[PDB]
Amino acid sequence: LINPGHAQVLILGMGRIGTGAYDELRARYGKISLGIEIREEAAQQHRSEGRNVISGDATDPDFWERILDTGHVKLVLLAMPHHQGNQTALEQLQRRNYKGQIAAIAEYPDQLEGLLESGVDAAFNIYSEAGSGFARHVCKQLEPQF
């Protein structure tokens, strides 16, 4: 947040998924991410916890035109796997002439397929990612002597 407004990563949805992604990116790159969260209470709690998060609706074209389309964004993470959130936000992003990368995480197989078909650069399954992270974090915390 050295230069406010200059986030290079947008994380759309700051539930547990978005937050996990936010924390990982911070660890690697420092403070280059902005998370977007529709629930105001949730956004305020993230800000209290020291994360760069604002409230707003990633399906609203005006929020895109007024706020999110800054010209600095290199990567957008779609972390709204329920209620067609990912696909709806993707639609808005594509209307804007966005030249960066897009990645999505989805709950089911056919959902990943539709996201890739609609032009996301990379798509992942929530649970397969969770299993991979789980195994790493366990080996980190417990250091089993294999």
Ligand X SMILES: Nc1ncnc2c1ncn2[C@@H]1O[C@H](COP(=O)(O)O)[C@@H](O)[C@H]1O
Binding-site residue positions: 37, 39, 57-58, 82
| Candidates 30-38, 60-68, 85-93, 110-118; binding stretch for a copy of itself (CB under 8 A) | 30-38
Of 65 and 113, nearer to a copy of itself (C-beta) is 113
69, 10 contact by CB (below 8 A): no
Instruction: Give the interface size with a copy of itself as a residue count (CB under 8 A).
Output: 51
Q: CB within 8 A of 78, min separation 6: which ones?
A: 12, 13, 85, 86, 89, 90, 102, 103, 104, 105, 115, 120
Longest CA–CA separation in the chain, Å: 54
Scan for tokens 């996990």, then name that residue.
20
Q: How far is the CB of 99 from a copy of itself (least distance, A)?
A: 13
Residues forming the site for a copy of itself (CB under 8 A): 1-2, 8-9, 15-25, 28-32, 74-75, 77, 79, 100-101, 103, 105, 121-122, 124-139, 141-142, 144-146
